[PDB]
Design a protein around this ligand. Structure first.
Ligand SMILES: CC(=O)N[C@H]1[C@H]([C@H](O)[C@H](O)CO)O[C@@](OC[C@H]2O[C@@H](O[C@H]3[C@H](O)[C@@H](O)[C@H](O)O[C@@H]3CO)[C@H](O)[C@@H](O)[C@H]2O)(C(=O)O)C[C@@H]1O
Ligand SMILES: [K+]
Length: 887
């Protein structure tokens, strides 16, 4: 396909030429063609072996959770909300133009729910989604009980050293480590069958009801409503609560009037957001906005009218780099015991990390690459009656101690915080630190903050956060954990990682691995499990310089942390990621080695490079465990890339010739209204970020079979941007040129941006040259003008006599392209634009010539050129030369 597909709206894809002109009749309502109703919209699409694969989801979708029976998750048949999301394969049926016709249609059904699963789901509770307008102080939650309150009680740390052996806390120096955060105030937590609110607290430390469902709706909901009334063109004070309803609609939250639908519905609707296609499979994953708890492996062989089943992430073991890193995450999921009763969580029923904030998903060769953020999941005491941690989440910093032998392996396998709290505040000599200074009677013991006495009678259930933080507790370690600010005091000051907060996750998934997942999802009766063994994790905090005025040298915590966040988020503590995309390096590799491929993904403050070994389709590793897993590299943004609003991401393309990724941001995606219900007026324009590879890539020469330095990427705000125009599309014609299609008012306009030593600037003469197509598919040709086709002046016929070429025959001349380059002088419109003459015999004594000229995309066009089989009829001239001999 010599074309570019452009999504004109939620239903229509039009095919464009390299001349930024639509192919006539190509524009197609893919929803209508999928025989889907007018409630469906395109979520994502992809080309695989020249066919178009489309993910559609419905605004009418209604899902339910009934904790009893056991077909617990189902669609709501009553009314009209039985509207599952579909993937559809389209093929181009015509060889002239574009007639999309439907090939295969796959329904994405709701997860099976095992008995073991439904016992966790019964009491599963989920945080209200983070938005544009969520503040550091909105997230912040009331600090829970200390380790030594949980265990010994109201009473003393004079007995902390007499007692800590009788609660398996031997040598624990942290009686005032936090056991977590209160669910009586803050961001709303809700079961699968409940609805999140449109109101977010400004200070969640004071203003939320947390998981207090019943309390919200009889007390605090009327307060929120009177303080933060929806617009009605009202206006109020927004002293205690933002109103984010439109910001909510924006990120794909659905609504019956002013009330969001249940959590399970928003989970399903988000879950069907991104797609990727291999020879054998379609895989479907969720967006960067809500946590997703399941993904689809559809077998492309699937019979026509089947119901493809999603695999739970709680049933999907990843390799987090080392077993310890898994344990860290699983230990903090909840309390495990043979001794307790009805106390069910993901950990107690032997599930793993249940939820990811997925960056996106792609295919290279027959491989699925994904990445994303570990969505915080912890236990919470849902007990009723004198339970000390009642209504409290059970969470702790897991950040590596100061004394930890440096080198990555050691850092991420440090025993610090493994089974319970250890971190808070420490004044050694006079050198403050939040992190334990060492990790002597014997070695330091950590324990899960559920006191031995209540071990039988306690009720620890699972929750999921809206973000990559486990721990919302309004203490100083929380800020430092979230911002990447904990450092050792050694002769290098390597930064001390968490293994529960701000954890990024990526991998490459083989077709056998996707085969288990399909097996997990079809499993009769009990939960079948999947190992994905080509994965890694990484501590990836938000950058500290996206905040101000942090104290060191009244410690600053979440309720008081100041955000200066330039990337379109109020908050400066919760990381985000978007637009994972893979691509084959075009740069030759040494023969008998296979082509290189990577991927990249945007996170707050930087681009991440994932690196692969094409040999056995593995993550790049190196021998040393000192250097850190060489599958991952982080290149921080400058001012210019940091300024881009990441919540406006529209689409990411990769071009195999340039070896370059294009990230398109469209500001029309911004919500209509603020959290204070103020019309949003910077909703005009768009921006392009260009990512390239940097470093020494695998398999250049004998030296680059071995690598001990991870290849990386570089994101550059390219110069292609606007605060004025409405974007239709950006066509990356070549490294040297991009075409932008936009409306100033309401008609489409073509700008050409020219790369000038790395910075793209508009070329107004070339823009006018390209845009002057006169209704044709391609720019006009004018004899007397340097236009998009440069300028061609033919020699006079009198050159034959002068140069004694009359003694040459037509066949001689016609097979001597260097002679017939001497029949014209060419003036390029852009540097190194090229042109040749095609010759045609006309008589025994004469021929004609007609220029073949490169356009902006590096391709040659002539009289016979087509796009999508349609002759362009550009209008190149023909020129007779005559007086040559017959021999
Ligand atoms: C996470 C935690 O609990 N941190 C505390 C910390 C640790 O116990 C040690 O750092 C581990 O080696 O100690 C801090 O206190 C040092 C000073 O504390 C004084 O005791 C306080 C303390 O708060 C209580 O735990 C104690 O039982 O009684 C006192 C309360 O009135 C020492 O007696 C004093 O001489 C100091 O050495 C610390 O900052 O390092 C306090 C941390 O909360
Ligand atoms: K011309």
């Amino acid at each position: 396909a010599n074309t570019f597909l452009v999504k004109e709206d939620s239903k229509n894809v039009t095919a464009y030429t390299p001349f930024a002109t639509p192919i006539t009749d190509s524009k197609s309502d893919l929803v209508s063609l999928a025989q889907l109703d007018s409630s469906y919209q395109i979520a994502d699409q992809t080309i695989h072996n020249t066919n178009l694969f489309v993910l559609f989801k419905s605004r009418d979708v209604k899902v339910k959770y009934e904790s009893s029976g056991s077909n617990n998750i189902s669609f709501d048949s009553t009314s009209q909300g039985e509207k599952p999301s579909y993937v559809v394969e389209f093929t181009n049926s015509t060889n002239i133009g574009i007639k999309w016709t439907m090939v295969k249609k796959y329904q994405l059904d709701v997860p099976n729910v095992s008995s073991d699963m439904n016992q966790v789901l019964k009491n599963l509770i989920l945080e209200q989604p983070l938005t544009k307008y969520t503040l550091n102080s909105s997230l912040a939650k009331e600090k829970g009980k200390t380790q030594r309150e949980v265990h010994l009680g109201s009473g003393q740390a004079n007995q902390w050293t007499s007692q800590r052996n009788q609660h398996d806390l031997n040598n624990n120096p942290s009686p005032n480590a936090s056991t977590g955060f209160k669910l009586t105030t803050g961001n709303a937590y809700r079961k699968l069958s409940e609805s999140w609110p449109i109101y977010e607290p400004i200070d969640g430390t004071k203003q939320g009801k947390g998981k207090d469902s019943s309390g919200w709706s009889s007390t605090e909901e009327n307060e929120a409503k009177n303080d933060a009334p929806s617009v009605s063109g009202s206006s109020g004070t927004f002293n205690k609560y933002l109103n984010t309803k439109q910001a909510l609609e924006s990120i794909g939250i659905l609504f019956d009037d002013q009330t969001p639908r249940n959590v399970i519905t928003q989970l399903y609707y988000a879950s069907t957001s991104k797609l990727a296609v291999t020879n054998n499979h379609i895989v479907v994953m969720g967006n960067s906005f809500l946590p997703s708890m399941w993904y689809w492996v559809v077998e492309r062989s699937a019979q026509e009218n089947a119901s493809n089943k999603p695999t739970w992430f709680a049933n999907t073991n990843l390799d987090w780099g080392e077993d310890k890193q898994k344990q860290f995450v699983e230990n903090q999921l909840g309390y495990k015991e043979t001794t307790s009763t009805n106390s069910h969580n993901f950990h107690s029923k032997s599930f793993t990390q249940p939820a990811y904030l997925i960056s996106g998903i792609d295919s290279v060769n027959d491989q699925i690459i994904f990445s994303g953020f570990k969505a915080g999941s912890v236990g919470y005491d849902s007990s009723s009656s004198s339970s000390s941690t009642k209504d409290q989440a059970l969470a702790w910093s897991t950040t590596t101690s100061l004394d930890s032998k440096t080198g990555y392996k050691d850092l991420v396998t440090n025993d610090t915080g493994l089974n319970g709290p250890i971190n808070g505040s420490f004044s050694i000599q006079d050198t403050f630190s939040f992190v334990v200074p060492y990790s002597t009677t014997g070695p330091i013991k950590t324990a899960y903050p559920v006191k031995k006495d209540q071990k039988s009678t306690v009720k620890i259930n699972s929750l999921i956060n809206a973000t990559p933080l486990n721990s919302y507790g309004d203490e100083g370690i929380g800020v430092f954990d979230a911002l990447g600010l904990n450092y050792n005091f050694k002769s290098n000051q390597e930064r001390l990682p968490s293994r529960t907060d701000q954890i990024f996750v990526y991998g490459i998934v083989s077709p056998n691995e996707l085969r288990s997942a399909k097996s997990s999802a079809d499993s009769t009766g009990s939960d079948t499990k999947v190992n994905w063994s080509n994965t890694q994790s990484r501590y990836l905090p938000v950058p500290y310089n996206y905040s101000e005025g942090i104290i060191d040298a009244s410690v600053t915590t979440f309720s008081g942390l100041k955000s200066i966040a330039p990337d379109g988020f109020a908050n400066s503590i919760a990381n985000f990621s978007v637009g994972l995309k893979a691509g084959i390096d075009p740069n030759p590799v040494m023969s008998g080695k296979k082509a290189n491929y990577g991927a990249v993904v945007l996170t707050r403050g930087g681009v991440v490079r994932l690196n692969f070994n094409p040999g056995n389709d593995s993550l790049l590793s190196t021998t040393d465990n000192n250097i850190a897993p060489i599958s991952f590299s982080f290149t921080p943004f400058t001012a210019a890339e940091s300024a881009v609003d990441l919540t406006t991401f529209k689409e990411v393309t990769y071009n195999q010739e340039s070896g370059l990724w294009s990230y398109i941001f469209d500001s029309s995606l911004k919500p209509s209204h603020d959290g204070k219900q103020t019309p949003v007026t910077d909703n005009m324009g768009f921006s392009v970020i260009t990512v390239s590879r940097t470093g020494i890539e695998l398999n250049q020469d004998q030296a680059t079979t071995t690598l001990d330095v991870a290849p990386s990427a570089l994101a550059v705000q390219s110069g292609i941007q606007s605060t004025t125009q409405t974007l239709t599309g950006v066509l990356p014609l070549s490294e040297e040129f991009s075409a932008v299609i936009a409306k100033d008012s309401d008609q489409n306009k073509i700008d050409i941006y020219k790369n000038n030593n790395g910075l793209f600037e508009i070329d107004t003469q070339l823009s006018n040259s390209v845009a002057t197509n006169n209704g044709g598919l391609a720019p006009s040709y004018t004899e007397n003008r340097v236009d998009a086709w440069g300028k061609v002046e033919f020699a006079d016929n009198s050159v034959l006599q002068a140069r004694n070429l009359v003694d040459k025959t037509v066949d001689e001349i016609i097979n001597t392209p260097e002679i017939l380059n001497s029949f014209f002088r060419f003036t390029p419109a852009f540097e190194d634009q090229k042109a040749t003459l095609v010759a045609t015999k006309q008589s025994d004594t004469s021929l004609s010539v007609s220029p073949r000229i490169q356009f902006l995309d590096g391709n040659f066009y002539d009289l016979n050129s087509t796009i999508a089989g349609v002759p362009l009829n550009i209008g190149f001239p023909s020129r007779v030369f005559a007086g040559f001999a017959a021999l």
